[PDB]
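Design a sequence for this backbone.
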C-alpha cells in the first residue's frame, strides 16, 4: 500500500524517526508516513549498547530522559512486544574530591526535578555492585529504576505501536529528492513512488547531512567512531541473583553493564586517540553502508581496558566475545538538533543524537507536541536546530565533535570553557585588540569578553565549583561601572531589521508591549498562544515603519524563525533582514558615560534632550552610529550600533576620549552582577517557554489592553484572573566561598519549594544575590528560605527589588523631589 498524500513524512526508520511516528499518530495525526531506506534500525540504532539512564548533567534534558524511561516501561503492555528493558539502576563513580563536588553540584540541580537521584556511600555501592574494586571509591551518583534496553526490540515495539495508530512505514523506500512548493508543502521522491507532504522531518541518522543537502542546507554533523567490548560468561556474574547496576567509571572514562552473564564496557578515549568519519563528510556516506560495523581497534582504547580490569577484577580472567565499532552522528556540542528549521518552510529535524536510545522516546513526544500545537511543550533551546550558523564550518564541526567525544566523562564545572575550533570567523577587529587583555568567552560562535586581566593576578582558565581567579577582577569591573565609566563589547546580539508595508501590524501582533513611537525603544516579549515567553526583544522604531529588533546571541535564529513563520502564516507583507553579522555594538555605561561621549559628537546628549530609551542616528568621531540611551547595567549609558568594520576604530576613539574619566573595560560576568542588582530578568534564565511573563514579574512590559489581538493575549488574561501559583523573587544570602548561578534547589522546612534561576555575588552588599521561583504564599519580602549549594543549605531572605535603583529611576526621584521641595 502506497499513500500519495501525507500530513507528515518522516525520513529515517531508526529509533528516533519511529518514536516520532508513534507519538504523532498516538496523538491523533492521520496520514503519517515514514520512509526508510532499507530496514528499520539499519543505521546506528541496531548496534547501540542501549544504556538508558535518568541522569543528565543539563536541566530540561532530564525531562527527555524521564519521559523515555516511563514510555519504555509501558511499551510491552501496550504492544505485546517485550523490549528487554533491564532496570537494575545506574551508578556514576567518584574517586576524587572534585568528582564528589560534581555530584553535589548535580544534586542541587536535580532535587527540584521529578528525577529520583541520590549520592550514595561506598557501603551502599558495594551492596549494589559487589564485584567492584572499592579501593579508591568515595561516592556514587545513583539513579534507581533505569538501566539498559534492547534497541532493536525497542524500535520494533514503537513500530508496532505506530502501525496500531495508523502510521504507514515503507521500506525499502529511500528518499532521493525533496522539492518545496510555494504553498509551503513538499514533493518527496522515492523509487517506490512520490508523496505530497504538508511537512517533512529529517531523522536520517548519519545520512542526515545528505538529506539536508537535498534542500540546500548544510547540517553541522559528523559521524564519530565508538566501541564497546563484550565478554563471555563470568562465573561470579552468573552466580548473582540480582542484575548488576549500570556503571560509569568517570576517571577511567568508560561505561559498563551486565550483558547476559558476562560484561559489556565502552570507553570514551581521548581527543588524540578517537576516530571519526571525516571522509564521509568530504565524499558522502558510502553507498551500500547499512547494518554494518567498522573494524575493531582494541589498541586505541588500551588505557581504558586496563582501567576497567583494575576496577572490576573479574574482567582479568574473562574472554572477549566481541568488539562493536560503529558510527554515532555527532553535532559540535554533543547535543542533537531537534525542532523546526529556520529559512525553509515545514522542514523539521531530529538529528545528531549522541544518545539516541535514551532520547528517542522523550524527543518523539516533544517534537510531536511542537508539531501539533505550534509551540514547544517545554523549553529546549539547547537542542534548537538553529543554534548553529555560518560560523559552524566542517572544520569547526570536526574539531568540536572530537572534543565533545574526548570530554565525555571529564569533571563538569560551572562556567565551563572549551577551546577547540576557536576562534571562529565570527569576530570583528576588536577581537585582536582585546584578546590578550581578557578571558574571551564563546557565545554562538562569537568571542565575547567575560572578564579582564589585572596585573599580577592569574590569567589562566581555572574552573571551580567555588569562587576562582575572576572573583576580584569582576568586583573591580563592577566598581568601574558604578564609579566612572565602562566599555563592553555587546556585538553578539541577534539583530533584525523589519520594514515594509505591514511592519507595525506584524510587530503589534507578535509582541505583548505597545509598539514604540518613532525615535524610541522598548522592551517587548513574543509570547506563545499559551502565553509562554518565547522571546524577549528590544524594539527600536528608527524611522516610520522601520524597526530594529535586538535579542541575545543564543536566540538569534530561534526568534527570527518565529517572526518569519508568523509573517507568512498571517499574510503580512514585510521585509525582514538578519543584520546580526553586519553590526557591532558597544555599551558605554556609568556616571561618566555622557561626559566621555559628548566630546565625540555634536548631538546634544544632555539628560533633558536625550531621554532614556530614545534612539538617534549620529556620528561618534565621524563614525556613523545609531545610539540608544539604555544599558543592561542600569547605570547611565548608551548602546552604540555600528558597522562591524568600524568596531576597532570606534572602541579606540572612545577609550582615548575617556582617559581623563578613567575609562576602562568590563565583561559579561560583571554585567551579570550589575543587572542582577537592578533585578533585570534574563531570557533563558528567568523566563522562557516554561514560564508566563506574569509569574516572571514582567507585567510592566505587558499591555493586556492594547487594541491588537497579540499572540497569547487571551491565555494571559485567563492566567492573571486565575491567580499565580508561584512568583519570581530576589534572594540575598551570606555564603563563605560559593555563589549561586541558578538551577539550585530552594528549600523550606525540609522540602524543596522552588529553584534559583540566576545568581551572582553582590559586591555592594557583600553577599550573594539570586533570582528564584517560589510558591506565591512564600514570596513575601522578608520570607526566609534556604538555597542548596554544593551539599550545604544557606539561609536566604526575599528582598524588595531592586537591590539598587536604576539611573533613570534615581534621576526621576531627584527631579520630582526638587519640584516638590520648591513649594
Ligand atoms: C555506535 C554506538 C552507538 C551507541 C552506543 C554504542 C555504540 C557502539 N550506545 C548507546 C547507548 O548506550 N545509549 C544511547 O542512547 N545511544 C547509544 N548509541 C547511539 C545510538 O546508536 C544513536 O544515537 C541512535 O541510534 C541514533 O538513532 P537515529 O534514529 O537518529 O538514527 P539511525 O538509527 O542512524 O537511523 C537513521 C535511519 O535513516 C535511514 N535513512 C538514511 N537515509 C535515508 C533516506 N534517504 N530515506 C529514507 N531513510 C533514510 C537509515 O537507513 C536509518 O535506518
Ligand atoms: N538594547 C538592548 N536590547 C536588549 C538587551 C540590552 O541589554 N540592550 N538585553 C536583552 C535583555 N532585556 C532587557 C531587559 C530590561 C532592560 C532594561 O533596561 N530595563 C529597564 C526598562 C526601562 C523601561 O522600559 O521602563 C527597567 O528599568 O526595567 C534591558 C534589556 C534583550 N534586548
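Sequence:
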Amino acid at each position: 500500500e502506497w499513500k500519495d498524500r501525507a500530513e507528515t513524512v518522516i525520513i529515517g526508520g531508526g529509533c528516533v524517526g519511529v518514536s516520532l511516528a508513534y507519538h504523532l499518530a498516538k496523538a491523533g495525526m492521520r496520514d503519517v508516513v515514514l520512509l526508510e531506506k532499507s530496514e528499520l534500525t539499519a543505521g546506528s540504532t541496531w548496534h547501540a549498547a542501549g544504556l538508558t539512564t535518568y541522569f543528565h548533567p543539563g536541566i530540561n534534558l532530564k525531562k527527555i530522559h524521564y519521559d523515555s524511561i516511563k514510555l519504555y516501561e509501558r511499551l510491552e503492555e501496550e504492544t505485546g512486544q517485550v523490549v528487554g528493558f533491564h532496570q537494575p539502576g545506574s551508578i556514576r563513580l567518584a574517586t576524587t574530591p572534585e568528582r564528589v563536588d560534581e555530584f553535589k553540584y548535580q544534586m542541587t540541580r536535580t532535587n527540584w526535578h521529578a528525577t529520583e537521584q541520590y549520592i550514595i556511600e561506598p557501603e551502599k555501592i558495594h551492596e549494589l555492585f559487589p564485584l567492584l574494586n572499592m579501593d579508591k571509591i568515595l561516592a556514587g551518583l545513583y539513579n534507581p529504576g533505569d538501566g539498559h534496553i534492547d534497541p532493536y526490540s525497542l524500535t520494533m515495539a514503537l513500530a508496532t505501536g505506530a502501525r496500531k495508530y495508523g502510521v504507514l512505514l515503507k521500506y525499502p523506500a529511500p528518499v532521493t529528492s525533496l522539492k518545496p512548493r510555494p504553498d509551503g508543502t513538499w514533493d518527496v521522491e522515492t523509487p517506490q513512488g512520490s508523496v505530497r507532504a504538508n511537512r517533512i522531518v529529517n531523522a536520517a541518522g548519519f545520512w542526515a547531512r545528505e538529506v539536508g543537502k537535498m534542500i540546500g542546507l548544510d547540517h553541522p554533523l559528523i559521524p564519530v567512531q565508538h566501541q564497546y567490548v563484550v565478554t563471555s560468561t563470568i562465573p561470579e556474574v552468573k552466580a548473582l541473583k540480582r542484575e548488576l547496576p549500570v556503571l560509569r567509571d568517570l576517571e577511567g572514562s568508560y561505561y559498563l553493564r551486565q550483558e547476559r552473564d558476562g560484561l559489556l564496557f565502552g570507553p570514551y578515549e581521548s581527543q588524540e586517540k578517537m576516530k571519526l568519519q571525516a571522509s564521509w563528510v568530504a565524499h558522502g556516506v558510502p553507498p551500500g553502508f547499512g547494518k554494518e560495523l567498522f573494524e575493531s581497534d582494541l589498541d586505541r582504547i588500551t588505557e581504558h581496558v586496563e582501567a576497567a580490569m583494575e576496577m572490576v577484577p573479574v574482567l582479568k580472567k574473562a574472554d572477549i566475545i566481541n568488539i562493536v565499532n560503529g558510527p554515532i552522528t555527532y553535532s559540535p556540542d554533543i547535543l542533537p538538533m531537534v525542532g523546526p528549521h529556520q529559512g525553509v518552510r515545514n522542514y523539521w529535524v531530529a538529528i545528531g543524537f549522541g544518545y539516541g536510545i535514551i532520547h528517542a522516546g522523550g524527543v518523539g513526544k516533544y517534537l510531536s507536541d511542537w508539531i501539533l500545537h505550534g509551540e514547544p511543550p517545554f523549553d529546549l533551546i539547547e537542542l534548537d536546530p538553529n543554534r548553529y550558523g555560518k560560523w559552524t564550518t566542517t572544520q569547526y564541526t570536526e574539531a568540536k565533535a572530537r572534543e565533545s567525544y574526548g570530554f565525555n566523562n571529564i569533571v563538569g564545572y560551572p562556567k565551563e570553557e572549551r577551546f577547540a575550533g576557536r576562534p571562529t570567523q565570527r569576530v570583528s577587529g576588536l577581537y585582536k585588540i582585546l584578546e590578550s587583555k581578557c578571558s574571551m568567552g564563546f557565545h554562538a560562535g562569537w568571542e565575547q569578553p567575560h572578564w579582564f586581566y589585572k596585573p599580577g593576578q592569574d590569567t589562566q582558565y581555572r574552573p571551580s565549583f567555588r569562587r576562582t581567579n575572576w572573583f576580584r577582577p569582576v568586583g573591580s569591573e563592577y566598581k568601574q561601572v558604578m564609579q566612572r565609566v565602562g566599555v563592553i563589547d555587546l556585538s553578539p546580539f541577534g539583530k533584525f531589521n523589519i520594514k515594509g508595508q505591514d511592519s507595525t501590524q506584524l510587530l503589534d501582533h507578535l509582541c505583548a508591549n505597545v509598539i514604540p513611537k518613532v525615535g524610541f525603544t522598548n522592551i517587548s516579549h513574543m509570547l506563545t498562544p499559551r502565553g509562554r515567553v518565547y522571546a524577549e526583544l528590544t524594539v527600536s522604531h528608527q524611522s516610520p515603519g522601520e524597526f530594529l529588533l535586538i535579542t541575545g546571541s543564543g536566540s538569534e535564529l530561534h526568534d527570527l524563525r518565529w517572526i518569519e513563520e508568523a509573517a507568512v502564516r498571517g499574510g503580512y507583507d514585510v521585509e525582514i533582514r538578519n543584520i546580526t553579522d553586519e553590526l557591532g555594538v558597544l555599551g558605554v555605561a556609568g556616571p561618566y558615560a555622557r561626559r566621555v561621549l559628548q566630546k565625540l559628537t555634536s548631538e546634544d546628549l544632555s539628560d533633558d534632550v536625550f531621554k532614556f530609551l530614545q534612539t538617534k542616528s549620529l556620528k561618534i568621531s565621524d563614525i556613523p552610529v545609531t545610539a540608544i540611551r539604555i544599558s543592561y547595567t542600569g547605570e547611565l549609558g548608551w548602546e552604540l550600533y555600528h558597522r562591524r568594520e568600524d568596531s576597532a576604530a570606534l572602541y579606540e576613539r572612545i577609550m582615548n576620549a575617556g582617559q581623563e574619566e578613567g575609562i576602562d573595560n568590563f565583561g559579561t560576568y560583571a554585567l551579570n552582577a550589575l543587572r542582577l542588582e537592578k533585578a533585570f530578568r534574563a531570557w533563558g534564565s528567568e523566563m522562557n517557554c516554561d514560564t508566563n511573563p506574569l509569574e516572571a514579574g514582567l507585567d510592566y512590559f505587558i499591555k493586556l489592553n492594547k487594541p491588537a489581538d497579540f499572540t497569547g493575549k487571551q491565555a494571559l488574561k485567563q492566567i492573571k484572573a486565575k491567580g499565580l501559583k508561584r512568583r519570581l523573587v530576589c534572594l540575598t544570602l551570606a555564603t563563605d566561598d560559593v555563589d549561586p548561578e541558578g538551577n539550585e534547589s530552594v528549600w523550606y522546612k525540609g522540602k524543596v519549594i522552588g529553584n534559583t534561576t540566576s545568581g551572582s555575588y553582590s559586591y555592594s552588599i557583600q553577599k550573594s544575590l539570586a533570582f528564584a521561583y517560589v510558591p506565591v504564599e512564600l514570596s513575601e519580602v522578608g520570607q526566609q528560605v534556604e538555597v542548596e549549594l554544593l551539599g550545604k543549605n544557606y539561609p536566604a531572605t526575599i528582598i524588595q527589588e531592586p537591590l539598587v535603583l536604576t539611573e533613570p529611576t534615581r534621576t526621576r526621584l531627584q527631579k520630582d523631589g526638587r519640584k516638590s521641595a520648591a513649594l
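The two ends are 89 Å apart (CA to CA).
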